[PDB]
Each structure stands twice: as C-alpha cells, then as structure tokens.
C-alpha cells in the first residue's frame, strides 16, 4: 500500500481544530495506509517552550493519539527527536533550500509577525518538516490547511534533490478535508485555531473539563443578528460554530439552520457545547488510561524503532548522493 | 587536562594557508590536550559540492591530517556526518540563536556577496560549528583568524542556552596564532586564501607538485617596486610573501629583508617557491602512504566511535535541559 506521514507539535494540548482538521482523520486512514504519525517535538521548539511542560506535552500527545484510536499495531507512533535522521535530513535539506523560499512562508512571517528578536529555527522549520515527509518515502500528507504551503515546498525540495543528485525522494501529496481543514479562533474569527494561542479563550482543548467548553462556547464571538445562518463572509463566528456543530454532529450546516430556526444564540451555544463535551468524553476516559501505565512509553519505544530504521537508510541514501561521509 | 576541537571543510584540497593558519598547530596541541580534529562535511555542502569530489576530498583530508603528523591514539580525527549528534545539537542551538545574529556573520555576507538565489545552510553555518564545538565541552578552539566571529557566537549561544535552561556547557575560547593567523590570497592581496577560491592561482594546496607551485608563486600579485621589505599597507602581497617565507624558513621578516637587500622579485620568489616545495615534500609522502591503505578507514571509524560516544551524551543532556523526548 502507499504511505502516510503526518505530525503534531507537542506544543500545548491538541484542540478541536487539530482533531477536526487532521487527527480524526488519522483513524481511518491507518486501516488503508502504512502511516507514520508524528509528535514533532523538534518543532515545538522553533519557539519557546517550558521543560517541564514540553515533557507532559509530549506524554499526553502521545496518550491523545492512541486514546481517538490510533492502534499502534497499524501504524508507526513516534517521537520525532528520538530518530536522530530527522535532524540528519534536515540539515541536507537546507543546504539545498533557498532562504527567500523559507522567507515567503506564510506561517513564518505570520508566527514572526510583529516580533523584534526571532529564532533561527522559526525561519528553518520548512526543512525539517520536509525532511520528516521525505523520510519515508511518504505519498500521502494528512494536514490541515495551513501546512498546504510547506507541503508545497517539501514537494519543491524532493524535486531539486531528484534532479540534482539523482532520483531518489517520493514527491508527497497533501490529503486536507474538504470540511474542517480550517477551525477557527473562538475569539478571533479571522484566524485559525491554534493550540498554542495566548488566549485559551481561542481553542477548547481534548482535555478540557465541561465547565471549561460551556465557558468557552458561551464566550464565542457572534453578531448581532441573533439568527443562526452560514455566512463565512457575513457571519463568521456562528459560521464556524456551524461548521463545528456540523462535522462533529454528522448533520449538515442546512439542517442546522432548520433546527434552529426562530432561535437563539443562547440555547444553540448551550447545545453546541454538550455536543463537543459529548465528544470528548470517550475519548478522555481512554487519555487517563494511557498517561497512567508504562505501555505508553512501549509504543513509544517500537515506534521509534520501526521509524529509525526506514529513516537512517534513507539518510544513508541521501548522504550517498550528496557525496557525505564514506562509502558504506 | 583540557579539551580541544577544531573542523576543517573537505570542500578542497587544504592549503597552506589552512596549514599555516591551524593544521601546522594541531600537531604540537595534540601531546598537551584532549583534542578533537573534524573533518565538517556537513559544513562543505553549504554550498555546491560535487559527490564525487566531495568523498574524495573528505579521503584526502583525513590522510593530510595523519600525513602532517596527527597520531590517531593521541587525538580523535573524525568526519562530521558520521556524528549524528552534530545535527542533533545544530537544530537546538539553531532554536535558540537570533536570524539577526546570523545575518550579520561576515562570513555569510561574505560568501552570500553578490549572489541572487542563496542556501539556507550558509546562513545556518553558524549553529552548526556551534554544536561542533559545545558537543565535545571543548576549552580551547585552535584557528583561523576568520573564524573568530564565529567563535563569539558560540560563546554567546553556549550563554544563552546556559542561563536560560541551566549550566551545561563550557564557554569555549578560540586560540589564533600571532604569526599567519591571516594568509593572503596570492593574486588578491586583499583577501584571504581559500581553498574553495574559484581561482587555483590564489592557494597553494599541501597537494600542489614542484611544477604548480613555482607558477603559482611566480604569478603572485606584488608592485613595481621591485623592493623586498613588509610594507602591509603600502605593499600586500610582498608583505604576504614574506609572511609565508619568515613560518615557514622559520626566518623573522626582518632577517628576509636583509638576505634579499639588493634583490630581486624573480629571485625571492624562486626561492620561496623551494622553500614551500621542500615543506611539503614529506607531507605528500606520507599522504601517499595514507591514500593507499585500509588503514585511514580503521582511523575514522575508531575516530567517529569516540565522538559519538562523546556526543550523543551531550546530546541527551541538552534534550533533558529543553525537555525534548522523554525521560531517560
Ligand atoms: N484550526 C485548525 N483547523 C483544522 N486543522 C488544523 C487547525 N490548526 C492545525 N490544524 C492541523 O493540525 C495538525 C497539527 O498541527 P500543529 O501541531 O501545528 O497545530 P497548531 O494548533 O497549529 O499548533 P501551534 O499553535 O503550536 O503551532 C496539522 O495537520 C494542521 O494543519
Ligand atoms: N588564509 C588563511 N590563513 C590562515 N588560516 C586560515 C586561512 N583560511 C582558513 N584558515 C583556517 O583554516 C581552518 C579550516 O577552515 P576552512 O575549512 O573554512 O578553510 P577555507 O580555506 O577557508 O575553505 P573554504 O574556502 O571552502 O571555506 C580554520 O581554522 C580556518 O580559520
Ligand atoms: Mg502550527
Ligand atoms: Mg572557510
């Protein structure tokens, strides 16, 4: 079968949107695909993080992943830095990427957008996440609308490296749903849900606590119309309340707008809420069950096994056409 | 005793500048400290290297290193690559150094002078020579007058990381000689030797025969003076030639200027020619020696089993500080 990569920075806890947008997906995928699926640590900290959080973060994105149903037995769970070929391939990537392409990144002058001082890796991300692609021969990248741009350019890198140095990388393809590749801030309509966004306010966690998501709901930015209606433009609050009612309902945004007809923000929140803490709560139960045995760290340790081995052949590969090191 | 590191790029053959400047001083530095001497072919690839002239060169460096006098059981001779480490730290450190810092190396100006389209391993230089030396809690770092700002840095990134995560590594000092710190180019006075100068009139490789070397010193760039006395300013390459014949005669200048009172370009160069031949005549002998053996390839492995040794615990320990992975 083809192959799957995709990752999730261990950078706060995952949200709505990361699961909406890419992890629920993960699920069904493993069954159809040979997928390695990712806790990018590597990349957490392109901006600061604190020890002692990161570790937890770490551990709990790991428990998340297994907990929505990620079997490890179907597919490859792992920690990005314990594959030491991951900053291999990612040093060759960048030798061979120009800095006006890492410049134009959306995502980069965004995440630099009004910062005096700047780290260098927030600029070299690119790299490293094309090496994480790249790495296992990957066909297929699971994401989440905003990653289209670095996938773009992986696809750019893997091309270069195939014409200069000889044939040698997959050119990947992003996979981004076509509803929920793009859940927005609770608090800021005009921008994406992010798990690490100042305001938690902006994000409702799979962790949170029900009293937790019914604040968070109530306290989403609508209008003043009073009337529940999609328009992205128009309405972009309660549109993307919709969308988030919607695909976790399994109704559509138009039998929606039917049922609550003649209401009411008030009741359509409070409604909204329990759907998401309803939701969330299988998948909870399960997260508490992995954080407190040692067969997180097992799955772990496999998955960093399987994962090291395809990736230091490829960087043997890559160093072979680069002219690195010696001949092996 | 005290620790010791310094890399030289396989991006060429190495020239006497290369030698005056650093190689001739690891020969003596190794009895009196623990020394580290890498062969950086991740830092080659910064720019266009050709594979095949890539392992060639990283061959033929190590086989100069030993050939000079590098005694293996005394010191660690190693390639770069063959140290997964280095890229492990290079992405850690490139986490915690400022995109402003890099941009104001010279040496990335320098090298990035005048080009369109530019890698982002130049820019990158920095983090990586950084990791090369905080790796192996090195005290001393014996150059290269032109890479002291890079050595700054270092200082600056092994503070940062110190004070913002906890103590781990030891601030390195560099180490540049008062004689040939700075070896100029011969058919441009105003700028230093490289061994990477598109122009093989400007070096003199340790690989150069009789032949190349008598031309190349012969077409060296001086003035119509036809007065042989150290005039830095006023005559540069004159001055430049004197500096190569007082190291490596082990005459002062002062002594040059009165052995050649009367004289005589034609003269004074043909003679500095011999004298650079007679220099390098027994290094090529033994590079010879080292060339044909099986025995240059034991060196390294036993070398790079050593670094990594080394290394991966630095690694680890810079990984628990971030808190990157897991507990180990
Ligand atoms: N608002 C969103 N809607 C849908 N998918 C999203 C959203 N935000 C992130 N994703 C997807 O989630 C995955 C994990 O990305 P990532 O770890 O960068 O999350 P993040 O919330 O954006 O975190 P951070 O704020 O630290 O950058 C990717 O596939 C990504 O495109
Ligand atoms: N002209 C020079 N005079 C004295 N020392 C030098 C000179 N050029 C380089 N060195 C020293 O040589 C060592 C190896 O450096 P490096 O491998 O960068 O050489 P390089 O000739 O400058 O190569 P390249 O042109 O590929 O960058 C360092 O210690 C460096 O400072
Ligand atoms: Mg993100
Ligand atoms: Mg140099």
Same mark, same amino acid.
């Given at each position: 079968?083809?192959?799957?990569?995709?990752?999730?920075?261990?950078?706060?806890?995952?949200?709505?949107?990361?699961?909406?947008?890419?992890?629920?997906?993960?699920?069904?995928?493993?069954?159809?695909?040979?997928?390695?699926?990712?806790?990018?640590?590597?990349?957490?900290?392109?901006?600061?993080?604190?020890? #002692?959080? !990161?570790?937890?973060?770490?551990?709990?994105?790991?428990? !998340?992943?297994?907990?929505?149903? &990620?079997?490890?037995?179907? /597919?490859?769970?792992?920690?990005?830095?314990?594959?030491? /070929?991951?900053?291999?391939?990612?040093?060759?990537?960048?030798?061979?990427?120009?800095?006006?392409?890492?410049?134009?990144?959306?995502?980069?002058?965004?995440?630099?957008?009004?910062?005096?001082?700047?780290?260098?890796?927030?600029?070299?991300?690119?790299?490293?996440?094309?090496?994480?692609?790249?790495?296992?021969?990957?066909?297929?990248?699971?994401?989440?609308?905003?990653?289209?741009? #670095?996938?773009?350019?992986?696809?750019?890198?893997?091309?270069?490296?195939?014409?200069?140095?000889?044939?040698?990388?997959?050119?990947?393809?992003?996979?981004?749903?076509?509803?929920?590749?793009?859940?927005?801030?609770?608090?800021?309509?005009?921008?994406?849900?992010?798990?690490?966004?100042?305001?938690?306010?902006?994000?409702?966690?799979?962790?949170?606590?029900?009293?937790?998501?019914?604040?968070?709901?109530?306290?989403?930015?609508?209008?003043?119309?009073?009337?529940?209606?999609?328009?992205?433009?128009?309405?972009?609050?309660?549109?993307?309340?919709?969308? &988030?009612?919607?695909?976790?309902?399994?109704?559509?945004?138009?039998?929606? =707008?039917?049922?609550?007809?003649?209401?009411?923000?008030?009741?359509?929140?409070?409604?909204?809420?329990?759907?998401?803490? =309803?939701?969330?709560?299988?998948?909870?139960?399960?997260? #508490? #069950?992995?954080?407190?045995?040692?067969?997180?760290?097992?799955? !772990?340790?496999?998955?960093? =096994?399987?994962?090291?081995?395809?990736?230091? =052949?490829?960087?043997?590969?890559?160093?072979?056409?680069?002219?690195?090191?010696?001949?092996?």
């Amino acid at each position: 079968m083809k192959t799957i990569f995709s990752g999730i920075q261990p950078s706060g806890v995952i949200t709505i949107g990361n699961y909406i947008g890419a992890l629920r997906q993960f699920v069904e995928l493993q069954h159809e695909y040979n997928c390695y699926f990712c806790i990018v640590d590597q990349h957490a900290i392109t901006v600061w993080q604190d020890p #002692h959080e !990161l570790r937890q973060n770490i551990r709990r994105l790991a428990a !998340l992943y297994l907990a929505v149903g &990620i079997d490890p037995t179907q /597919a490859t769970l792992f920690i990005q830095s314990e594959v030491p /070929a991951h900053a291999q391939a990612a040093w060759m990537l960048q030798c061979i990427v120009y800095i006006g392409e890492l410049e134009r990144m959306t995502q980069f002058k965004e995440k630099s957008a009004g910062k005096e001082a700047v780290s260098a890796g927030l600029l070299t991300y690119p790299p490293l996440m094309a090496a994480d692609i790249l790495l296992y021969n990957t066909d297929i990248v699971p994401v989440g609308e905003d990653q289209k741009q #670095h996938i773009e350019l992986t696809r750019d890198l893997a091309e270069r490296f195939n014409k200069r140095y000889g044939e040698l990388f997959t050119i990947p393809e992003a996979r981004i749903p076509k509803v929920g590749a793009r859940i927005m801030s609770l608090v800021d309509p005009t921008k994406k849900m992010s798990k690490s966004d100042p305001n938690p306010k902006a994000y409702i966690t799979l962790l949170d606590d029900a009293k937790t998501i019914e604040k968070k709901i109530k306290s989403a930015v609508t209008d003043s119309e009073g009337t529940i209606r999609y328009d992205k433009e128009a309405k972009p609050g309660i549109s993307n309340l919709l969308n &988030i009612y919607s695909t976790l309902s399994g109704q559509s945004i138009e039998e929606l =707008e039917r049922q609550y007809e003649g209401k009411g923000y008030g009741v359509f929140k409070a409604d909204l809420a329990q759907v998401v803490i =309803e939701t969330l709560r299988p998948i909870q139960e399960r997260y #508490h #069950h992995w954080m407190e045995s040692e067969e997180l760290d097992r799955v !772990l340790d496999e998955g960093a =096994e399987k994962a090291n081995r395809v990736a230091s =052949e490829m960087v043997r590969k890559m160093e072979q056409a680069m002219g690195l090191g010696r001949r092996r």
